[PDB]
A paper describes a structure:
To explore further the structural and functional similarity between THOV and influenza polymerase domains, we determined the structure of the so-called 627-domain of THOV by crystallising a construct comprising residues 543–701 of THOV PB2. The structure was solved de novo using anomalous scattering from a mercury derivative and refined to 2.4 Å resolution. A large region of the IAV 627-domain surface is positively charged, consistent with its ability to bind RNA. The corresponding electrostatic surface of THOV 627-domain also has positive patches but less uniformly. The structure-based multiple sequence alignment of this region of PB2 strongly suggests that DHOV, Jos and Quaranfil have a similar three dimensional structure to THOV, although Quaranfil is more diverged.
The three largest gene segments of the Thogotoviruses, THOV, DHOV and JOSV are homologous to those of IAV and code for the heterotrimeric polymerase. In this paper we present the atomic structures of the putative PB2 cap binding and 627 domains of THOV and the putative PA N-terminal endonuclease domains of THOV and DHOV. Despite very low sequence homologies, all domains have similar folds to those of the corresponding IAV polymerase domains.
Residue numbers in the entry: 547 to 681
The structure:
């Protein structure tokens, strides 16, 4: 199930800094990761990979301690999921989208966490309708 599968991954990364840092580094540099094939099943085939990796690298440069902050983890999780997604080899690479629909579904996934799978109201962080953090 794409929904439940996305929910599991994002909980593991948003709630755990060490796992999020590991996950992000593996997606950015393409090394083994337990969510490798999961990531590929969730994102439609796209041309966004290099853009996502640039974004990831800008963030690490500007704030090394990004993994300390839950809002940043959610954002970097979004970019990392795209960074490890299946790329269309025949098309020009293009800019990452701000949101996309999880593969084979109308489940929206938003980078700024306004809508869909991951929702951040500045009080809670809600993953798949389940509140996982509350300030």
């Amino acid at each position: 199930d794409p929904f439940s599968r996305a929910k599991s991954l994002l909980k593991s990364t948003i709630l755990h800094a060490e796992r999020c840092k590991e996950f992000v580094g593996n997606m950015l540099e393409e090394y083994q990761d337990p969510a490798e094939t999961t990531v590929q099943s969730l994102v439609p085939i796209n041309t966004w990979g290099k853009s996502a990796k640039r974004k990831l690298q800008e963030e690490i440069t500007s704030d090394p301690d990004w993994h300390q902050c839950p809002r940043k983890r959610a954002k970097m999780s979004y970019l990392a999921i795209i960074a490890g997604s299946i790329q269309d080899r025949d098309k020009k690479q293009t800019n990452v989208p701000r949101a996309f629909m999880l593969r084979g579904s109308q489940i929206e996934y938003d980078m700024k966490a306004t809508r869909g799978l991951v929702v951040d109201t500045t009080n809670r962080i809600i993953v798949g309708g389940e509140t996982v953090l509350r300030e």
